[PDB]
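Objective 1.3, modelling of assemblies. Example input:
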Amino acid sequence: KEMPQPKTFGELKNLPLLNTDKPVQALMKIADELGEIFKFEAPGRVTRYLSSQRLIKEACDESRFDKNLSQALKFVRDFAGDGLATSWTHEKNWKKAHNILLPSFSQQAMKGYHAMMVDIAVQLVQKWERLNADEHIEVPEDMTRLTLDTIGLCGFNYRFNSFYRDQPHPFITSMVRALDEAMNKLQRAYDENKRQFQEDIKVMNDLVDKIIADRKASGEQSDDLLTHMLNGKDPETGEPLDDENIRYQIITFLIAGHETTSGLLSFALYFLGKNPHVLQKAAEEAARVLVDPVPSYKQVKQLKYVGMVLNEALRLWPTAPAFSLYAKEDTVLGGEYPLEKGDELSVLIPQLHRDKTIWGDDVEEFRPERFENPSAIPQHAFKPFGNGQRACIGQQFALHEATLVLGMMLKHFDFEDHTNYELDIKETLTLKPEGFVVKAKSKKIPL
Amino acid sequence: IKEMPQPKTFGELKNLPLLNTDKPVQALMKIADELGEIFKFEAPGRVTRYLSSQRLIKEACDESRFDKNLSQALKFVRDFAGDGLATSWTHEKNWKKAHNILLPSFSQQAMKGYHAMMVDIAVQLVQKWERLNADEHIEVPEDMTRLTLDTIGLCGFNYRFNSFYRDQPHPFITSMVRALDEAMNKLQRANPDDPAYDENKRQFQEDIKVMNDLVDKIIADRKASGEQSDDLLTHMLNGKDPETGEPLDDENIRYQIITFLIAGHETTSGLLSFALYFLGKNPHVLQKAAEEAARVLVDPVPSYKQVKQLKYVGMVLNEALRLWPTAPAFSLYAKEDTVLGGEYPLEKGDELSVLIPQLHRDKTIWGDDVEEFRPERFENPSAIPQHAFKPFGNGQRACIGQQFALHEATLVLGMMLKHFDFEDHTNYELDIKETLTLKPEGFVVKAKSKKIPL
Ligand code: HEM
Ligand code: HEM
Ligand SMILES: C1CNCN2CNCCNCN(CN1)CNCCNC2
Ligand SMILES: [Cl-]
Ligand SMILES: [Co+2]
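Predicted structure (tokens):
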């Protein structure tokens, strides 16, 4: 009835608890101590962190709660604008872009992207085939090279050529620095930060706008999201996306997809390395199914156990670990916690995924077999892709890409944990295993 | 590309007379021992291929290539189970509709609601055995069937068959068992329109009418009463398919009720019986199981949470399903032309039958000790290769009742071990009777009460 609350720091209330490298991990520990719900206060604001499937299923009721922009999303909005991920549900451009882009992201639409995903996957596999005996792989670094290049090519027929470099494409440099500035503002001479922030925004916009105008003037048609956006009309308003919003969407697809998908691949590879029984089943499937020198769309869909490995990695370490909601009207949560219109909730996805009343007593174990029967998972128990109409539009893209790439990696190599790597989870706006490195031993299967 | 072996033929009847035996599944297991992982089986008008290796069965379980087929047995059972979940094709509207409506009634969560009524019947079983005199013994499969039928009747439609109050079953049960028997016997009939069978046909129709009359009455009583229980019937009357917002019609509801009794009672009863048989043959396993039951079941009746902690008991049950899966076969058809195992080309529509007891004896999976009863094999699901263990079928057409069956069997086996030591007073020799399911015929024991009150 009265909600618990963690330790306070006088006038700063709970705010200094987030003054740390690893705030989500700090909140998970607080949730272990305090339970399914706790209040978090800061000067001028309040939120309530939810961890149980019991309360989170109510929060996922779209008639009672809508998406809120966290402070991080509000800062990212300075360069992602009113793109899909940083727009409010009630802004005209949210519904417009949603209606226009949903058909570009369906399971069916992945057939058109497949060839370009394969282009980048092959580049990754060739890079690793070409290492010398003495060398190792930096896993999150190479996964990020891959996911960025894949979203560039499928998104706007643009090659970042990340496997040709040590210093990224200037675009990527600016984007990563902008994200970093957005994140750093969350807990704050800064005139130089501000000048840099503006320059990085100008870099991102100049590139993207040029491409859009080149494509518009050329009239050429590709198998990309940019083409669908230029041809697309919203049935409701009858309008296409304006050129500016198109550019916010392109920036959005890079920011929203690349880092989360890269983290997923990295965690999956980490967990496979720690669970040889799971690795054996995954690798067997990859060998049996991927019988051609490059994978087909239909073959990726047959990688069922690989998909289960990916879902279990998202269970333990959902790479976009939180989403925020507000109460549409006065309402009572769980029969116990009255909320007023406008009150904020935050869903702690890693804690949801550790609800023992749902998953049983072995919640920290890596066991893909939990996902063997998709029907056995209760509704709202597993939410790595958010909720409802504001769920991840890129879900099918992310999973097709990760399934393809993890399948090819297992097909072509055995991986060795040559450093006895200790998991260290770095937090940006997403989660990834920092410093994860492996050595590969080629199975010598040609492409 | 190889040519598959085929067992001996009988002219016009092809391989059909091989199934004209008391124990057809056991006969097929012996054929599989002789011929290997795959063999063709022909009968007038039909062909199937029996699979026995995990190597081939993992491909057969690919839902993109193969879908559920109704075996000839399922086709005959469909005369009384209609388009209930077990006898419907995946592409019939009522399959997906009933599946969507009923899945929430069968979840691990939903078992909390059934627990009390499962306990009601389990207590009756325990009291029966506490009340035997010194001279007497237990008929195990008979008492397990009394239990499983009564449990599904009470949890399924708030109806008491009162099987522990009788020698001759409820008329419903008599008809159902006789219908199943007729369905089974038609499978081996070389001359099904011989006049000899006109009485079989008349009897079959009467038994169908008995089943339908009872069930339809209950449905209409409940509909007119408006009363709400903790049962499957209530969920079916209230339930709306999320896609369409439509409920099941009254007739399909009656097929589903007939289906739950047929599909759950016999298999679960067999599982309990085999588990008890194996515990009696493996004293070291019995000791661990009984130790767990005594340590976990600390109250006079078990709670839901306690049953979930009976982990070794659950492993015992999985190992019993390994050696003697009580629904021993399922059938598939090829969705399109495809090649099985890199060696056997199949055409669209071609049939496969998975011989589950033989899958479960694949030495390349389980090792050289495959005939030994070792529950410890199930300690880590990740160590088991894909599709090696299929007692509940496959994919979207897997057993909807799996959690129900295992909760019930875990509860009841836990209580039996808590309350009694069992004696193999006859040195019983395993004899496996075949209906459409498997059970140990004539298994009897004597119980010695531990005198622990309920
Ligand atoms: C494993 C990979 C991914 C994860 C875990 C993930 C997770 C999420 C989550 C949790 C949200 C909801 C955020 C909120 O409520 O505030 C979301 C939204 C979104 N994601 Fe992803 N995502 C992934 C990959 C991708 C990819 C590859 C793309 C694009 C190609 C993408 C584009 C988006 C967009 C546009 C939204 C906003 C949708 C809307 O509100 O209309 N994501 N994602
Ligand atoms: C140890 C006990 C049990 C075993 C071994 C077992 C086994 C199976 C198998 C192998 C199938 C698939 C059949 C096929 O592919 O043709 C199946 C389906 C089914 N079982 Fe069970 N079962 C058991 C208990 C139960 C119980 C207790 C219920 C109901 C309360 C039940 C209801 C069903 C239903 C309705 C289907 C059809 C599901 C569908 O296709 O949508 N079973 N069972
Ligand atoms: C026609 C040939 N009948 C010869 N006999 C043996 N056939 C066994 C299978 N019978 C099924 N059909 C079809 N068989 C017709 N039954 C006729 C009686 N069987 C005699
Ligand atoms: Cl005939
Ligand atoms: Co004949």
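The domain at 1-447 of chain A is CATH 1.10.630.10 (Cytochrome p450).
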